[PDB]
Curated annotation (Swiss-Prot), chain A:
This is Gamma-tubulin complex component 2. Ubiquitously expressed. It comes from the Eukaryota. The chain holds residues 771 to 871 of 902 of the full protein. Transmembrane segments: none annotated. Belongs to the TUBGCP family. It is linked to Cortical dysplasia, complex, with other brain malformations 15: An autosomal recessive disorder characterized by global developmental delay, variably impaired intellectual development, speech delay, facial dysmorphism, microcephaly, and varying degrees of cortical malformations including pachygyria, thin corpus callosum and subcortical band heterotopia. Most patients have generalized seizures. Component of the gamma-tubulin ring complex (gTuRC) consisting of TUBGCP2, TUBGCP3, TUBGCP4, TUBGCP5 and TUBGCP6 and gamma-tubulin TUBG1 or TUBG2. TUBGCP2, TUBGCP3, TUBGCP4, TUBGCP5 and TUBGCP6 assemble in a 5:5:2:1:1 stoichiometry; each is associated with a gamma-tubulin, thereby arranging 14 gamma-tubulins in a helical manner. Gamma-tubulin at the first position is blocked by TUBGCP3 at the last position, allowing 13 protafilaments to grow into a microtubule.
UniProtKB/Swiss-Prot annotation, chain C:
Signal peptide: none annotated. This is Tubulin gamma-1 chain. The modification Phosphoserine is found at S131. Changing L387P: In CDCBM4; the chaperonin-dependent folding and hence the yield of monomeric gamma-tubulin is compromised.
Swiss-Prot record, chain D:
Component of the gamma-tubulin ring complex (gTuRC) which mediates microtubule nucleation. The gTuRC regulates the minus-end nucleation of alpha-beta tubulin heterodimers that grow into microtubule protafilaments, a critical step in centrosome duplication and spindle formation. This is Gamma-tubulin complex component 3. Belongs to the TUBGCP family. It comes from Homo sapiens. Ubiquitously expressed. It is found in: Cytoplasm, Cytoskeleton, Microtubule organizing center, Centrosome.
Amino acid sequence: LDDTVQLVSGFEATINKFDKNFSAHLLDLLARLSIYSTSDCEHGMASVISRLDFNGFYTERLER
Amino acid sequence: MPREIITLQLGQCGNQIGFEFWKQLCAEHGISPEGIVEEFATEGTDRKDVFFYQADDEHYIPRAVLLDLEPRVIHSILNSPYAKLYNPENIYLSEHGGGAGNNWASGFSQGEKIHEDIFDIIDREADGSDSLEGFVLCHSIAGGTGSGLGSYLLERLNDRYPKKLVQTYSVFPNQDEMSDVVVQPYNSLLTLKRLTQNADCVVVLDNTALNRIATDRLHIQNPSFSQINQLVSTIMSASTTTLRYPGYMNNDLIGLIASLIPTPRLHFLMTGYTPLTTDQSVASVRKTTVLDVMRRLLQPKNVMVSTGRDRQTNHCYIAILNIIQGEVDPTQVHKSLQRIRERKLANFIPWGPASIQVALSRKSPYLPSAHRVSGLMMANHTSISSLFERTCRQYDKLRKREAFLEQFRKEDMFKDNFDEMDTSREIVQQLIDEYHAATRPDYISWGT
Amino acid sequence: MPREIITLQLGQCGNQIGFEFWKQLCAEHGISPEGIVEEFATEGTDRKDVFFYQADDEHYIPRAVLLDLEPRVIHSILNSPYAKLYNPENIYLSEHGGGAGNNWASGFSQGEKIHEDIFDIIDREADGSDSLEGFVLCHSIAGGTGSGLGSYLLERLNDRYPKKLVQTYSVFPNQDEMSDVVVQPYNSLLTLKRLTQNADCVVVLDNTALNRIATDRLHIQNPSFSQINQLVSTIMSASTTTLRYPGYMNNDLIGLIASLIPTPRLHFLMTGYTPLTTDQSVASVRKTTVLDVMRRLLQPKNVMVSTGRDRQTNHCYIAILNIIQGEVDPTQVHKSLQRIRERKLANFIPWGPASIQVALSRKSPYLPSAHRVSGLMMANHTSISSLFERTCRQYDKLRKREAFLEQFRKEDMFKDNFDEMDTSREIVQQLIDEYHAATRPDYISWGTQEQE
Amino acid sequence: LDVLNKKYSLLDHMQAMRRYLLLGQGDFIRHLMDLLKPELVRPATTLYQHNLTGILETAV
């Protein structure tokens, strides 16, 4: 369809904030998955985890 | 309904690639040269409607458009048994038959002259598609027709079909060989300009890499155009296998390309093929494991891209998609990924999470495969910039020498200036740097 | 993962030894002349990755680098049946083919000139190694290529791979034969200097001892380089068996040698082999006992190191490691050690607790062994300094006569002076003094600059 | 005895105990320790059981 530039920048900022929240919830999900994989010895979830942080993006969050 | 794909084959090289692709698809699907399904072609498991149309309940016609500005090649194609595979209503031929003279500017001018015919052909083919995703152009970037006419077609498709996907099969000029086409850097620049402004996806096909692979991997001392075309047809077949071997995943082009293009700007794709074998080595069906398959695929000798050894840039993979075809054990895939991670066989982007996607695919049932397992690699690797950087360096070498520019100034597209070539060179340099930047965490702010 | 070892074969003698070593390793591992594991070689229990690389899922390629400054030997290697066993990217041949002319200085200059190309080849071979530990150089110290090119390569490897171990198998000139190469003692001195400064371990191979053994034991009047190379290949096979027959202990070279080299200066290793048998006596697998093994090992005829008779230094054994191959009973080993101690069959260092270590090893399953029991002796004996002192004396004998020195003065390494020979003499003197000190309790201060 | 051998591999289980639990696979133990050094040097409170199991599988 496109103050309009300000609206676009605000939308981008809101998207980035939602993305931050999503990433935090995803890291919490990965932690819960790790807990479940350690309880149930589910190698599948460990393979999923190794897939998820191939570039190590999630590795620092897991350490945190 | 399937998302039909119209295949546009442009210039001598592009038209040869398209013809060999249609031949290979017919052979894999058991389709006769006339477009009729052979009685042996009972495996209705392929999705032809993505790339082929049914002319009747029995006859499948390729959704292929053969486009040339010179009549010689089109007439030679029309003398093959496969003349009936393509819909003639989707074929636009330039009336002048003179070609582009290996001049991109001439190709663009010819496209402008055949614009009406080309868009009429495109619309006629579009109405035959139930859920047309977009158009796929197969062309060379070094010639005139496939480069110039291809760029014109891309521009007009972008203007007219802004809601359709645009994939290209773009044959890039050899960057390691001194091109006899002194205007190849001009042609390459115009093609890169259009890819930056008007293409959504550029599949780079480096003739230098094709020759290198034929020599080192196919053991072909002097690779013929025909052998390169057959290798390209094998690659295209592998790229279309997910359409030809339907499965649980990656059943659509957007699903295939999403993993390769993380951002709209990062739309430059590199290709990989597996298993790479010399024609003589067909004899031994090696029980290659997914780990073994990936390891051979990870070998540059098996890589379908000849990147120079850049000593200055720590090139890395931005993204990897492995399409594996044939009998695949999931546990072997898991072990392969495990071994790849343990061995750090792939470097991923530092600015975001990146990994090697692995797809397992069936082979075509109508074509007996000598190999139990085959594989395609799609990868975003910063060393592919070295091919692009090498092309840019050759462009700069010609532009700094103003070599053969008087012939382009003879053509209206280049008559007044070569500013499009210089902007293309700058954009390609920025692309090389971004591909190098994409190996670094600061790639998040790269290009800002 | 295995600690891969790159084998460097230098000059005519070194390259022949490397070729025969690769043949022996292939035979022990059941690798075909093309590098492919034979179908009968179903025991996947060997660790090829320590010494071999896989060329394919079936083809094992030796982690061996054949290096010469003269193309004749490399071409002769490429004409053998084993040409397809090795990875061709690990083969470096000097383009000029002229060799070093039996001049260490010329070999060093050639190594310096081919440093970039050689290190590119080395890196190409290294990528085929999953966990490359380091390089092993097989060479002669008397020639030009194996001595000079070997010294240059050792220097560049030490500079480039400062964290990797560098062991050398250095073939020393025959000391009982008058060398026609009057500058051979100078070349040997320069090579020993470089081994002192840039090598971590030098295995001394005296051509005089090889010829003597061939004459008295093999009945070979004129031992060829090939016969010496086949004996060396047998020795190398025995030394690599613990890599080829994995077990609980001694799975790596560094673990084996750590007990032997207390200080960087005490880097002169002695070798021993058992059982020593003539080729004709293969028929009877003699049930040699650990006591019998130890008794035969103490015979100088069975020691694979020719240490000079030092009359000035009360040379003694600091420590002994016996690598025994074949069927060994642990209780027999214990009783043998007890008997050796009671019989004082081994002298230990006077400055610390020391004993005779005993290793029991399996034979290669792919190679039929004619002997029920085989053994390697590793010993630290101060008389090995006398071999180095003898080399120094030969160097001094040539330098004092300036014999054949003009050929070395043609090469930059020896053009201005013979300082490498004098440094070799000083290093051998320090080695002699430390070896004498190592027989004494004051060895605790041996190698301290105040003691030097 | 036949049942124990065929169904529970009792003698084979003992051989496995020798190779692994008795550290008979010395090369494996060496490589495992080399990989573990950066992990085993860390405080045991910092060890993740899932991470240790994944490292074990990778070393194997």
